[PDB]
Design a protein around this ligand. Structure first.
Ligand SMILES: Nc1ncnc2c1ncn2[C@@H]1O[C@H](COP(=O)(O)OP(=O)(O)OP(=O)(O)O)[C@@H](O)[C@H]1O
Ligand SMILES: O=c1ccn([C@@H]2O[C@H](COP(=O)(O)OP(=O)(O)O)[C@@H](O)[C@H]2O)c(=O)[nH]1
Ligand SMILES: [Mg+2]
Length: 457
């Protein structure tokens, strides 16, 4: 915020809807929201429906709260101006697309990939915000509804927009990218497909490849040079000018030095080279950095400004955020977690100093291997130079059993409420000594709360 307001005319024109009983708002709309709990005077309540729910059911609530404007699929019997449209989900997409179009001064990026989307997006935001007002995706608003919701936040001051697209299924990326109308778009990588997921990895590649379809004239397609699908992705982008990142590509890194909380490397590009002291840890973040560089070069940003942007960029919440507290270290890497990611984080914890204790949560999405996965993990993780391995969750016992000849190193737990005391006690268990805490786990375990609860102590 703030938000550039809408006039009744603009709302009507973008959706081609009609004002119920000719009741046209005489004041502008300051905001368009879908949450009936927050709609107030000046807002336009957009009623969405879906699997087992229909926000049209809550229109009386926004009316009671002062809201006098709503965007609906069917006229409701209540005292409120109503812009009637055929489909409110499509109308939302049209409102975002219309605002995007009205902001002709924008240079737009759209990116996707199986991993590193948010990090790369943050890196670009850092680079571009140094130059001019820039709007980047917030949180996970990267789907059919999220993308347009973000575009509603565009303002005349914005010169750049970095839109993250997180869809993985056929036709989804075409939908959101068409709304976005990017000048530069591309794919970071193609990961693994869900167990039994229709299409497999090939399906993810075809889905994400839809991101090249609506690149504007004289635009640029960014492609990953080191991915199992590089050849297929290059073919999909053949109708556009191409720039690549990764080994053997246009933008790549050499002499990488992985430091405890950062990474050093020599950056190579068609616009020259430069050393980079990247304030992010791990090789994956170096790869994300190279992608950000390619995306930025495609927008005409100088190499000098790109490096400056990278060196002062900050990671997203829950993505390896180093929090130093007294002689103790707290690495908040709770955003999400998977098979690999969990073992990778363990290492980063090792590269640190003092007493290493990895507070992990449930890795949620291994259907039946939830026991087998956590079993082997706790086995290999407890086999590392790690000191203590606190495991919280329903499959925490699966890790304790897997520990095997390392059961004295791992102590399972069902809840944070039960584990918290163990960490507080384990703190003094080592008297005044430095300790490195690394909190990981799937998004639903919200391990950041436990970490916050332990730090607030
Ligand atoms: N290039 C990469 N390859 C593989 N994993 C990565 C890469 N960059 C980051 N990660 C891993 O992905 C996790 C999330 O990173 P990030 O939020 O940037 O990705 P994302 O693609 O936005 O996630 P989501 O799919 O939920 O949108 C990190 O904790 C990290 O382990
Ligand atoms: O009771 C509800 C359920 C959903 N929504 C809105 O409708 C959107 C889409 O909901 P859906 O269940 O279709 O997808 P989800 O967001 O849960 O993935 C959400 O982002 C909300 O903004 C709402 O207003 N009330
Ligand atoms: Mg994301």
């Amino acid at each position: 915020v703030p938000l550039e307001p809408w006039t009744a005319q603009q709302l009507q024109q973008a959706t081609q809807g009609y004002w119920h009983k000719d009741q046209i708002p005489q004041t502008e709309i300051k905001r368009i929201l879908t949450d009936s709990r927050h709609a107030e005077s000046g807002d336009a309540f957009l009623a969405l429906k879906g699997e087992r729910f229909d926000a049209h059911n809550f229109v009386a609530q926004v009316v009671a709260n002062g809201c006098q404007v709503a965007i609906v699929e069917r006229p409701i019997d209540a005292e409120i101006a109503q812009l009637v449209v055929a489909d409110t989900r499509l109308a939302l997409g049209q409102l975002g697309a219309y605002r995007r179009e009205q902001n002709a001064q924008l240079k737009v990026i759209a990116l996707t990939g199986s991993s590193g989307k948010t990090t790369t997006k943050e890196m670009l935001g850092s680079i571009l915000s140094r130059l001019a007002p820039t709007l980047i995706t917030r949180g996970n608003l990267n789907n059919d509804l999220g993308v347009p919701m973000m575009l509603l936040e565009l303002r005349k001051e914005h010169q750049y927009a970095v839109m993250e697209l997180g869809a993985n299924h056929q036709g989804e990326i075409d939908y959101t990218s068409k709304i976005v109308q990017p000048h530069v778009a591309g794919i970071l990588n193609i990961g693994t497909a869900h167990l039994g997921e229709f299409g497999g990895r090939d399906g993810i590649c075809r889905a994400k490849s839809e991101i090249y379809r609506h690149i504007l004239p004289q635009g640029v397609a960014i492609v990953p040079q080191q991915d199992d699908f590089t050849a297929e992705i290059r073919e999909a982008a053949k109708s556009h000018q191409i720039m690549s990142f990764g080994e053997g590509g246009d933008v790549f890194a050499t002499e990488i030095e992985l430091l405890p909380q950062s990474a050093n490397f020599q950056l190579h590009t068609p616009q020259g080279s430069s050393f980079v002291r990247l304030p992010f840890a791990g090789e994956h973040n170096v790869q994300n950095a190279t992608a950000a560089v390619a995306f930025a070069l495609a927008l005409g940003v100088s190499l000098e400004d790109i490096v400056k942007g990278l060196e002062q960029a900050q990671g997203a919440k829950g993505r390896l955020n180093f929090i130093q507290k007294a002689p103790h270290l707290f690495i908040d890497d709770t955003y999400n977690a998977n098979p690999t990611s969990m073992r990778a984080a363990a290492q980063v914890l090792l590269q640190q100093n003092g007493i290493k204790v990895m507070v992990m949560g449930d890795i949620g999405e291994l259907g039946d291997s939830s026991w087998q996965e956590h079993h082997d993990l706790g086995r290999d993780l407890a086999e590392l130079p790690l000191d203590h391995i606190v495991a919280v969750g329903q499959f925490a016992s699966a890790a304790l059993e897997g520990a095997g000849l390392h059961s004295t190193k791992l102590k399972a737990f069902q809840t944070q409420a039960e584990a918290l005391p163990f960490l507080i006690n384990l703190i003094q268990t080592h008297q005044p000594q430095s300790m490195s805490f690394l909190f990981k786990g799937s998004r639903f375990t919200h391990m950041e709360t436990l970490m916050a609860d332990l730090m607030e102590k």
